[PDB]
Subunit: 237 residues, 4 copies
Amino acid sequence: ADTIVAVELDTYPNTDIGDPSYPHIGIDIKSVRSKKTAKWNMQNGKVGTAHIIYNSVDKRLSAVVSYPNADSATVSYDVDLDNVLPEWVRVGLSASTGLYKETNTILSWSFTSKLKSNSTHETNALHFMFNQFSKDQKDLILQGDATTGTDGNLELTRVSSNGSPQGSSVGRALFYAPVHIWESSAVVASFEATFTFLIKSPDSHPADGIAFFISNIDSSIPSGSTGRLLGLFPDAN
Amino acid sequence: ADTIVAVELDTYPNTDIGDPSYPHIGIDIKSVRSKKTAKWNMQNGKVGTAHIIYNSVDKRLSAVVSYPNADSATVSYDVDLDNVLPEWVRVGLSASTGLYKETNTILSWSFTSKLKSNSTHETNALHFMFNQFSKDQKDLILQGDATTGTDGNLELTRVSSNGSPQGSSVGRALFYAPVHIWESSAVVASFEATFTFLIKSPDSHPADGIAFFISNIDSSIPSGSTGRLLGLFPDAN
Amino acid sequence: ADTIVAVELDTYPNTDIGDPSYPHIGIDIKSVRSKKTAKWNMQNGKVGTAHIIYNSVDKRLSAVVSYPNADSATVSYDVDLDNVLPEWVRVGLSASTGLYKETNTILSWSFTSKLKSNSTHETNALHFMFNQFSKDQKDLILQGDATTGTDGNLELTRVSSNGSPQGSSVGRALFYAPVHIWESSAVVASFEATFTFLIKSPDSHPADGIAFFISNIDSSIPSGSTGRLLGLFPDAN
Amino acid sequence: ADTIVAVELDTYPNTDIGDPSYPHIGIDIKSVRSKKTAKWNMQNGKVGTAHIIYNSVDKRLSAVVSYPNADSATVSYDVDLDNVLPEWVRVGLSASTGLYKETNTILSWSFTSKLKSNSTHETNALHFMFNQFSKDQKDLILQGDATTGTDGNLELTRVSSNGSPQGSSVGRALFYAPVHIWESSAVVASFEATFTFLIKSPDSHPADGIAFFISNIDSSIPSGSTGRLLGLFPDAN
Ligand SMILES: [Ca+2]
Ligand SMILES: [Ca+2]
Ligand SMILES: [Ca+2]
Ligand SMILES: [Ca+2]
Ligand SMILES: [Mn+2]
Ligand SMILES: [Mn+2]
Ligand SMILES: [Mn+2]
Ligand SMILES: [Mn+2]
């Protein structure tokens, strides 16, 4: 039902469904089986940063993930989003845990989209930036186990009182306002997203990951999408 | 019921309710009877621009209106918005006509709000800019007679096929996402709004005006607020 | 001597040096002989808009040129600017006339460059926007025949009192501050430029064109670069 | 000679020249004897943040300084900068030490100035943001003992190898490009500056302070302005 385009930070290798045998970043177009992936040297307990960029002229979705003092990981995929997504969409973050677990903490999130028309100086834009989340964040649609306010952070999946991450959890956060990514008179459409995250697990095998995604405006968590499905897909096809 | 703070571009002098005897700009705090006004040399048929600014440190709401090749008009009022408005609000534009009429056309509208916390680099922001409006503008809540899409403009009040403005009309447009204007750890909160408009009337006496306003999130047009009430107030108290 | 990367809006076809036989837009890397070009339906006397974009992840320089009510023209070229340009550069606009002529008027110009480091939230940026130019524009380095202030515009090449464009003219405008386009710890570097122009000629054959360019910081107009050389190259190799 | 407007973070009370008997923030208009001050609970060794704002409509220069987990300090002063400063100015940071000392480390610095003209959509802007400084920062004019690059920070005054601050030191950093703060057709001019700093001293009595300042473009450090004069004034009048 839902149309999903996402950049996944996959912490657990499910080789039975196409994941490489190591943590990786990937670009998912309507399927959890990434169209392209790159090895990611994930660091348990460290704050990392992900940057996602795209523009309608080049038609290439690219993402870069890094941690301080370390080399980055990058992945790119040629795709025309006009042919995949509706004209109006919502953007958000999703995460899940299953048998294995980890905290999926978001410390900041910014997004900027621009539509440049052929009229002189005619440019439409939307920009939001969160460097702190409140208990009652009215401009976010929280789904599943996601909550905001703990230490000013956004916890996508369940975490107990003692800070311990729970398994079989799924949660998403979408920006309240729909986003216009295509318009008939637009000559250039582009967006850039950045978010900082903290994945921590008491185990040697963290799971399952975090994903930045773009979807139809009325998207909701598919049934049974905990674990390897990242709260984004109904199955592994 | 609704809590309204607005900057009015009042084209018709209703001296019976406190308006000066000439077109004027004014600052309205919960009442159509402006707390402060300034003479405005309105130009029928010309595109004008209004700028509104405010910050929590100075606690002064100021507005400047101008037309190309002409001197500007300015008005300021000392007011602490924390004591007038809720923590979360919606921002919008409103206009009305009555026995007398005019077109209340909006050609562009931008808004920027910022909340700077005491945490290092911790800043929250929201910014939107419309230089063109579509027939289906999903990020705007249109109320009353307001419509978008005609020539790429936002028509706040009714205009016939031949471009002729109708009387007894009222319409408003609010940005979809609520806006956070106060937070317990914020050291500075501020906003700036800019919109360009075209007020045109076939008559020597245009009415009634356009207003930029901030209100509780669930604000709706009060009954009988056409004409002198600008689609904002239930009465003239 | 100078290192030049430029996007040319070439109004005169010099087929003897590789130009296609029609006005065109092209990407020039250290040579006036464009690495790639696209047909451009230039409109004499109309205000057009050019958009240029690039990022270090995709390594693709793309440009889009359009006029109101018309289809756009686009050109892209895969090039790693890190391998062509120095770490610090200046950005500017250049234009020329020769035997044939045209006005090379710039009405607005904006530029944004960003360097995102691997440190958390660590981002460096520079942004400038001119929608009007003054007689004494201290933040611009004017070279050759370029002047600012006439009607608030930037005239890159000589125009007489009666508004008539002169031949054999060359002029450039560079932003005063050097721009940092590469840094050892940067994970993503990108820039976007936009400018609106008005090319008008009394003749059926306008020449020679306008170009947005990036160069070493101490770049100056090469001798004899009027005409087909666009004020950028010392010869046609 | 120089014309100086500055916001001082004064760490040492020189009661003989008008300082209150405690660390304080103040607004200086052409004299080190602040026109207005406010008590500042300075924290040795902690990273603080200063915000400075001003607009031509309200004509009020305000500043807010804070540290994480602490209440802020604010100071405001009504002053028309058009009557004090030239049309073109440079903005910068200055610091000094004398008999007593402290490190005057700047970790980030951002600035935004806007000039809104009466022409439709006509707005000029300049914005820069440094979250990291390089050894060779070509867009900064360093004066005196100021250096960049150590740990990616800007050290305004001398610090030895072991990180120990030196006395009798003075240094300033100005942004390379001049800034336009007034224009004949501007209806609103405004600026906002933010910088984070780390003042650390091995002594119970740190000195002398840091100041954000605006000056004529060719401003240089006055002779003998170490110590209480903050590298800004030639004497204490
Ligand atoms: Ca997986
Ligand atoms: Ca009235
Ligand atoms: Ca040519
Ligand atoms: Ca002192
Ligand atoms: Mn995967
Ligand atoms: Mn009134
Ligand atoms: Mn050519
Ligand atoms: Mn003092």
